[PDB]
Design a protein around this ligand. Sequence first.
Ligand SMILES: [Cl-]
Ligand SMILES: [Cl-]
Length: 85
Amino acid sequence: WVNPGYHYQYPSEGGTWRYGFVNAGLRSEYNHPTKVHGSTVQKLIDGKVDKTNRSIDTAAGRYSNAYVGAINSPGLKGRYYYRTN
Ligand SMILES: [Cl-]
Ligand SMILES: [Cl-]
């Protein structure tokens, strides 16, 4: 199970990174105001990777969108990634 709602980090590279269990999925979303950027999320069940979703290379000023639809079940955990180009 994942304590729901976006969690936030502020990369040294710039921008805002938000991720977590939100609106029926695991999500990783990164906004960089000027650079091409992206994000990735992995869905874990009992520690095993069930799915990986990688955002496309995303335009400056928009949040990248990495998502896996999920039930917030007892075995659910997420792992989250961001990138700049
Ligand atoms: Cl990424
Ligand atoms: Cl695995």
